[PDB]
């Protein structure tokens, strides 16, 4: 049917295409060299939705399926685990290149305790890494957090406490407690006096981009577009920083996608300076300064969309068109793909496609950041039709 | 979530377990032998939804996927084509049992015109058979018919007229014009003076049940239950007739499923005599098919009258499977049997409902997906847009 979901598109006026030596090819390859050594490492699939592409009037839609990222059902461990290994190497005078997980898991002596607030994936990545490397993790989750997500963290040997407070007030609590007990704060965002850990996290994320470029070359295609869903913009910064170093910022039409009740990057893109302001994974508060730098320099467009666009994405991915492969994608995982679908069925299709510079030739890269990390919610969306379109 | 979709279950107080020699193993075997001679014949898959069965607390859920039937995206040609071939053999003084479909294709004689009313699949099956056999077909469809289904028929070289009338009235226009022109009416229901053709159709339908039994035997399983969606009940009658011949009506817990805005079998089942009862394509009912009603009244365990949205839920559950289960493209009417199981699972009265239906950890449940996405617009509105949502 024809339906109107809110798709607010803003041109990035602050664009200057200045690329980042910091978040480029070479660091991504270092991070990937670390991941390749982890048991069970395998590049996550890059699925070609040729039949959806035909329907939507583009050449190709390519979906990087981070549900297959080890056993975590999301991409996050790429950054979290890298950062944690770097912290350990720095403190204990070890070499990242020759790090032994078996040695670290069993070794006696001093242990770090990693403290983190999460709404789901980030904290699970931190917990997994601490468990693998024989360290401790204490994970804080805000009020309303899914029990399955809590249990996933508990099942990794981490402590997990669900507060009576929201995400932002929970982060402050993590910080206070960490300072009090001498814990090592591991958040996936940066603030004044806290950039080292989130830098490694963003460098680690670029592994998926390095994998994806390899897969697109294997496919003999060049991306014209990329949609990147953004909470604080850590993933988008790390991933766009990489892609733009490979293809140049001028030749990649990049679109940053956020839900409209936490669109901190969008609101910063209109203003041209950081603005403080939700589906798990895309919470914000304030843009990550390190990601923000990349996006304002190199992002083509920002999108502020109503939350049901994510739900549309989930369903389209979960029951594909024609003969296309099926992808299990969580709410924040699917929202990039959701935008393409929302556009397709919108009364204003033609002029939205023109604004996104989407045409018969476009080769669109999409990232599915997580699978069904909350199965109750996933099935309510795909089976019950929760967050319906009409 | 926990949600309550209308699922009214009525025990068949009229059950007597009288089977039907007319709709049994031997006629089904004969029909299947016929179908096996048609280009493109392949038994349709019987999919094991193991992970969904574990979630729902039964042993097995097996879905006969009739979207794979000869490129037609529904089961109906099994009936319609069999009847059309029977009628042609009768006219040309031929023995249908001892010839090939290709011999029939190139048969020589006076041309026949087959006239039919349909809301989708039945008329498509008729048009398909007419095209194959070099005969003519004239299909009528009622006001509201999806343009795609009209076009499916037109693409088979048949005429297709969308009327202003509803299903029941449009059928009368078909009879009228056929009398007027010397056309042969081919409808998938019976009335007084008209039972030869719907009998063939119901026997032809039994091929899907014959295949499923063979498939279940290869899997080493025995069904405890069957859910059968029913418009007029030609499919349910034909299929339950075969199954109950194979399994005994006492050892098969059969559940007939209807939408509540046309639950003609259900209403007949509580009342005892035949009751004349917008509707999802395929499950329309004016009055029950007397040929089918006889079988169901005798042999059906229970009748269900359910909310429209039960079918929508089924479509989504089949199209985006649980765990590692295979995926199935199932239309609104195709999916309603499976929808019932899903509605039961999430219902607050899940326990008593399961008890009523005798579903437990030993249950082996045969479901028929009678069609795929015969209306792609509607299909995608349901599975993607969440049209006809639970909430």
PDB file of C-alpha atoms in Angstrom, chain A residues 209-330:
ATOM      1  CA  UNK A 209      33.973  -2.494   6.708  1.00  0.00           C
ATOM      2  CA  UNK A 210      37.267  -4.137   5.688  1.00  0.00           C
ATOM      3  CA  UNK A 211      35.409  -7.458   5.355  1.00  0.00           C
ATOM      4  CA  UNK A 212      32.607  -5.724   3.375  1.00  0.00           C
ATOM      5  CA  UNK A 213      34.917  -4.018   0.888  1.00  0.00           C
ATOM      6  CA  UNK A 214      36.632  -7.363   0.298  1.00  0.00           C
ATOM      7  CA  UNK A 215      33.186  -8.912  -0.301  1.00  0.00           C
ATOM      8  CA  UNK A 216      32.071  -6.135  -2.647  1.00  0.00           C
ATOM      9  CA  UNK A 217      35.281  -6.553  -4.656  1.00  0.00           C
ATOM     10  CA  UNK A 218      34.731 -10.312  -4.727  1.00  0.00           C
ATOM     11  CA  UNK A 219      31.275  -9.432  -6.125  1.00  0.00           C
ATOM     12  CA  UNK A 220      32.912  -7.082  -8.638  1.00  0.00           C
ATOM     13  CA  UNK A 221      30.783  -4.143  -7.525  1.00  0.00           C
ATOM     14  CA  UNK A 222      31.423  -0.610  -6.250  1.00  0.00           C
ATOM     15  CA  UNK A 223      29.082   0.934  -3.647  1.00  0.00           C
ATOM     16  CA  UNK A 224      27.515   4.282  -4.607  1.00  0.00           C
ATOM     17  CA  UNK A 225      25.694   4.521  -1.280  1.00  0.00           C
ATOM     18  CA  UNK A 226      25.916   3.590   2.367  1.00  0.00           C
ATOM     19  CA  UNK A 227      23.239   3.855   5.099  1.00  0.00           C
ATOM     20  CA  UNK A 228      24.630   3.878   8.641  1.00  0.00           C
ATOM     21  CA  UNK A 229      22.314   3.812  11.675  1.00  0.00           C
ATOM     22  CA  UNK A 230      23.727   6.003  14.476  1.00  0.00           C
ATOM     23  CA  UNK A 231      23.294   6.144  18.251  1.00  0.00           C
ATOM     24  CA  UNK A 232      26.237   8.264  19.356  1.00  0.00           C
ATOM     25  CA  UNK A 233      27.958   7.616  15.965  1.00  0.00           C
ATOM     26  CA  UNK A 234      30.812   5.294  17.028  1.00  0.00           C
ATOM     27  CA  UNK A 235      29.991   2.639  14.394  1.00  0.00           C
ATOM     28  CA  UNK A 236      29.184   5.179  11.679  1.00  0.00           C
ATOM     29  CA  UNK A 237      32.391   7.110  12.367  1.00  0.00           C
ATOM     30  CA  UNK A 238      34.638   4.022  12.364  1.00  0.00           C
ATOM     31  CA  UNK A 239      32.918   2.491   9.364  1.00  0.00           C
ATOM     32  CA  UNK A 240      32.504   5.664   7.297  1.00  0.00           C
ATOM     33  CA  UNK A 241      36.096   6.692   8.158  1.00  0.00           C
ATOM     34  CA  UNK A 242      37.235   3.389   6.600  1.00  0.00           C
ATOM     35  CA  UNK A 243      34.941   3.409   3.575  1.00  0.00           C
ATOM     36  CA  UNK A 244      35.776   6.985   2.709  1.00  0.00           C
ATOM     37  CA  UNK A 245      39.534   6.168   2.830  1.00  0.00           C
ATOM     38  CA  UNK A 246      38.848   3.395   0.255  1.00  0.00           C
ATOM     39  CA  UNK A 247      36.381   5.140  -2.079  1.00  0.00           C
ATOM     40  CA  UNK A 248      36.837   8.873  -1.247  1.00  0.00           C
ATOM     41  CA  UNK A 249      34.071  10.925   0.502  1.00  0.00           C
ATOM     42  CA  UNK A 250      33.062  12.566  -2.794  1.00  0.00           C
ATOM     43  CA  UNK A 251      32.216   9.252  -4.490  1.00  0.00           C
ATOM     44  CA  UNK A 252      30.279   7.715  -1.648  1.00  0.00           C
ATOM     45  CA  UNK A 253      26.794   9.000  -0.923  1.00  0.00           C
ATOM     46  CA  UNK A 254      26.512   8.336   2.791  1.00  0.00           C
ATOM     47  CA  UNK A 255      23.332   8.565   4.812  1.00  0.00           C
ATOM     48  CA  UNK A 256      23.246   8.638   8.607  1.00  0.00           C
ATOM     49  CA  UNK A 257      20.003   7.255  10.023  1.00  0.00           C
ATOM     50  CA  UNK A 258      18.540   7.898  13.494  1.00  0.00           C
ATOM     51  CA  UNK A 259      15.165   7.580  15.254  1.00  0.00           C
ATOM     52  CA  UNK A 260      13.543  11.006  15.763  1.00  0.00           C
ATOM     53  CA  UNK A 261      13.294  10.825  19.572  1.00  0.00           C
ATOM     54  CA  UNK A 262      17.101  10.459  19.903  1.00  0.00           C
ATOM     55  CA  UNK A 263      18.416  12.078  16.677  1.00  0.00           C
ATOM     56  CA  UNK A 264      21.437  13.743  18.291  1.00  0.00           C
ATOM     57  CA  UNK A 265      23.611  13.618  15.127  1.00  0.00           C
ATOM     58  CA  UNK A 266      20.802  14.962  12.925  1.00  0.00           C
ATOM     59  CA  UNK A 267      20.186  17.870  15.353  1.00  0.00           C
ATOM     60  CA  UNK A 268      23.934  18.520  15.444  1.00  0.00           C
ATOM     61  CA  UNK A 269      24.094  18.447  11.629  1.00  0.00           C
ATOM     62  CA  UNK A 270      21.548  21.264  11.269  1.00  0.00           C
ATOM     63  CA  UNK A 271      23.257  23.351  13.967  1.00  0.00           C
ATOM     64  CA  UNK A 272      26.893  22.525  13.115  1.00  0.00           C
ATOM     65  CA  UNK A 273      27.813  21.805  16.749  1.00  0.00           C
ATOM     66  CA  UNK A 274      27.064  19.060  19.338  1.00  0.00           C
ATOM     67  CA  UNK A 275      23.469  18.824  20.678  1.00  0.00           C
ATOM     68  CA  UNK A 276      22.333  16.783  23.725  1.00  0.00           C
ATOM     69  CA  UNK A 277      18.936  15.035  23.395  1.00  0.00           C
ATOM     70  CA  UNK A 278      14.557   4.536  22.342  1.00  0.00           C
ATOM     71  CA  UNK A 279      15.179   1.322  20.364  1.00  0.00           C
ATOM     72  CA  UNK A 280      18.104  -0.487  22.008  1.00  0.00           C
ATOM     73  CA  UNK A 281      21.467   0.312  20.433  1.00  0.00           C
ATOM     74  CA  UNK A 282      20.624   3.751  19.074  1.00  0.00           C
ATOM     75  CA  UNK A 283      20.318   5.660  22.347  1.00  0.00           C
ATOM     76  CA  UNK A 284      22.372   8.836  22.375  1.00  0.00           C
ATOM     77  CA  UNK A 285      22.210  11.818  24.721  1.00  0.00           C
ATOM     78  CA  UNK A 286      25.197  13.502  23.057  1.00  0.00           C
ATOM     79  CA  UNK A 287      27.111  12.635  19.861  1.00  0.00           C
ATOM     80  CA  UNK A 288      30.438  10.848  20.309  1.00  0.00           C
ATOM     81  CA  UNK A 289      32.963  13.659  19.480  1.00  0.00           C
ATOM     82  CA  UNK A 290      35.271  11.238  17.618  1.00  0.00           C
ATOM     83  CA  UNK A 291      32.467   9.869  15.399  1.00  0.00           C
ATOM     84  CA  UNK A 292      30.923  13.335  15.018  1.00  0.00           C
ATOM     85  CA  UNK A 293      34.163  14.660  13.516  1.00  0.00           C
ATOM     86  CA  UNK A 294      34.016  12.010  10.748  1.00  0.00           C
ATOM     87  CA  UNK A 295      30.333  12.483   9.972  1.00  0.00           C
ATOM     88  CA  UNK A 296      30.269  16.280   9.820  1.00  0.00           C
ATOM     89  CA  UNK A 297      33.351  16.182   7.547  1.00  0.00           C
ATOM     90  CA  UNK A 298      32.308  13.293   5.348  1.00  0.00           C
ATOM     91  CA  UNK A 299      28.567  12.422   5.695  1.00  0.00           C
ATOM     92  CA  UNK A 300      26.366  13.293   2.728  1.00  0.00           C
ATOM     93  CA  UNK A 301      22.971  13.339   4.453  1.00  0.00           C
ATOM     94  CA  UNK A 302      21.382  12.883   7.889  1.00  0.00           C
ATOM     95  CA  UNK A 303      17.979  11.222   8.293  1.00  0.00           C
ATOM     96  CA  UNK A 304      15.605  11.621  11.231  1.00  0.00           C
ATOM     97  CA  UNK A 305      12.901   8.933  11.047  1.00  0.00           C
ATOM     98  CA  UNK A 306       9.886   7.767  13.066  1.00  0.00           C
ATOM     99  CA  UNK A 307      10.489   4.571  14.987  1.00  0.00           C
ATOM    100  CA  UNK A 308       8.187   2.311  12.935  1.00  0.00           C
ATOM    101  CA  UNK A 309      10.598   2.559   9.969  1.00  0.00           C
ATOM    102  CA  UNK A 310      12.845   0.188  11.989  1.00  0.00           C
ATOM    103  CA  UNK A 311       9.971  -2.316  12.401  1.00  0.00           C
ATOM    104  CA  UNK A 312       9.267  -2.204   8.643  1.00  0.00           C
ATOM    105  CA  UNK A 313      12.967  -2.980   8.050  1.00  0.00           C
ATOM    106  CA  UNK A 314      12.861  -5.980  10.414  1.00  0.00           C
ATOM    107  CA  UNK A 315       9.924  -7.501   8.545  1.00  0.00           C
ATOM    108  CA  UNK A 316      11.325  -6.907   5.070  1.00  0.00           C
ATOM    109  CA  UNK A 317      14.649  -8.510   6.059  1.00  0.00           C
ATOM    110  CA  UNK A 318      12.958 -11.455   7.847  1.00  0.00           C
ATOM    111  CA  UNK A 319      10.672 -12.379   4.946  1.00  0.00           C
ATOM    112  CA  UNK A 320      12.568 -11.411   1.796  1.00  0.00           C
ATOM    113  CA  UNK A 321      11.183 -10.581  -1.637  1.00  0.00           C
ATOM    114  CA  UNK A 322      11.464 -13.049  -4.517  1.00  0.00           C
ATOM    115  CA  UNK A 323      14.393 -15.450  -4.146  1.00  0.00           C
ATOM    116  CA  UNK A 324      16.532 -13.149  -1.910  1.00  0.00           C
ATOM    117  CA  UNK A 325      18.295 -14.547   1.170  1.00  0.00           C
ATOM    118  CA  UNK A 326      16.608 -14.118   4.561  1.00  0.00           C
ATOM    119  CA  UNK A 327      18.271 -12.031   7.317  1.00  0.00           C
ATOM    120  CA  UNK A 328      17.320 -11.907  10.957  1.00  0.00           C
ATOM    121  CA  UNK A 329      17.670  -8.295  11.974  1.00  0.00           C
ATOM    122  CA  UNK A 330      16.854  -6.562  15.287  1.00  0.00           C
TER     123      UNK A 330
END
